[PDB]
Homo-oligomer: A and B are copies of this chain.
Amino acid sequence: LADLFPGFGSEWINTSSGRIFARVGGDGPPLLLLHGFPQTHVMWHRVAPKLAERFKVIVADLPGYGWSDMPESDEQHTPYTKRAMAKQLIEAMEQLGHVHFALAGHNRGARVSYRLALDSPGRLSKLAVLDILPTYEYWQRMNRAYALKIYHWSFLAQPAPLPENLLGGDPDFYVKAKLASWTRAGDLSAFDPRAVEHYRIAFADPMRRHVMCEDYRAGAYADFEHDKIDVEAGNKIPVPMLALWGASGIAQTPLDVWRKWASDVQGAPIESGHFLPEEAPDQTAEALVRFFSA
């Protein structure tokens, strides 16, 4: 497995729910970066160097992903709810002495991030979400066209062991297909092969795939209910917020949606499929540096 973060340390951070793995580089204000599915912290390898020019950058594997430990789940998928993942990452950041930090997330990691901002806004100075809308919004939009396009939100959420059993046949194929299908190119050519190997290696482990399905089960049930309470309450994120999205990505009218969720948000499309930090590393890094800079 390649080292894709020149000048970054490797840290195992303890929490009450298990260790969080992170690459840590740079100096200055702290900035936490959170990946999603089906990836690991290494998806930030093209933009983290640029960020570490100006920030102390912490590139964390989500609870249960990558090299982070896997807490035992329960019937309500609790540890892989975004509320719980956010609480676990707040604890990890406390181990480093960071109780007020900047945060950028992509895919599942952006769901942890906006949930963190709703539950504990005092933890965050600024928030960036990459190519997502809130979980509640994607479910409200779940008509035929969306059921077909984001089928995996329902498939991966089927009761165990249905998706686990199917994924075990040829996991390499499924993970590479998801990576390719959500890019603009439709193939794997936007990715560093060394990074694809990190993603394949993780996805090859049945325990890791089981966590992924628990994460989508949470996304269909408790995460949805948590979001629904905030919508019913008219709660809005007060943290200054940036929403970036792919011109051919999944979130796509994104700024109009996030404005119903957040009182201070700017945004922009980037010509890219879903995987902004890998398909469009220079534009994503520039937008993030400019946003997070005081």
Binding site for B on A (CB under 8 A): 139-140, 142-144, 147-148, 151, 153-155, 157-158, 162, 165-170, 173-174, 177, 220, 224
Contacts and interface: CB of A to CB of B under 8 A. Distances in A.
Nearest to A170: B165
A26 B148 CA distance: 44
Contacts of A144: 139-140, 142, 220, 224
Given A140-B144, A148-B154, A169-B170, 19 more contacts: A142-B143, A143-B143, A144-B220, A144-B224, A147-B153, A147-B154, A148-B220, A151-B151, A151-B158, A155-B155, A162-B177, A165-B169, A165-B170, A165-B173, A166-B166, A166-B167, A166-B174, A168-B169, A168-B170
A139 B147 CA distance: 9
Q: Which of A140, A144, A157, A165 has the most CB of B within 10 A?
A: A144
Q: Which of A140, A177, A224 has the most CB of B within 10 A?
A: A177
A154 B157 contact: no
Contacts of A143: 142-143
A148 to B, nearest CB: 5
A56 B148 CA distance: 41
Contacts of A148: 154, 157-158, 220
Q: In the assembly, how many copies of this chain are there?
A: 2
A215 to B, nearest CB: 15
A12 B173 CA distance: 39
A151 B165 CA distance: 16
Contacts of A168: 169-170
Contacts of A174: 162, 165-166
Nearest to A143: B142
A151 B170 CA distance: 21
Nearest to A162: B177
A191 to B, nearest CB: 19
A169 B173 CA distance: 12
A235 B74 CA distance: 49
B147 A142 contact: yes
A154 B169 CA distance: 20
A180 to B, nearest CB: 11
A142 B142 CA distance: 7
Contacts of A158: 148, 151
A166 B173 CA distance: 9
Contact of A166 (B154, B157, B169): B169
A145 B164 CA distance: 21
Contacts of A139: 144
A175 to B, nearest CB: 12
A224 B144 CA distance: 10
A164 B166 CA distance: 10
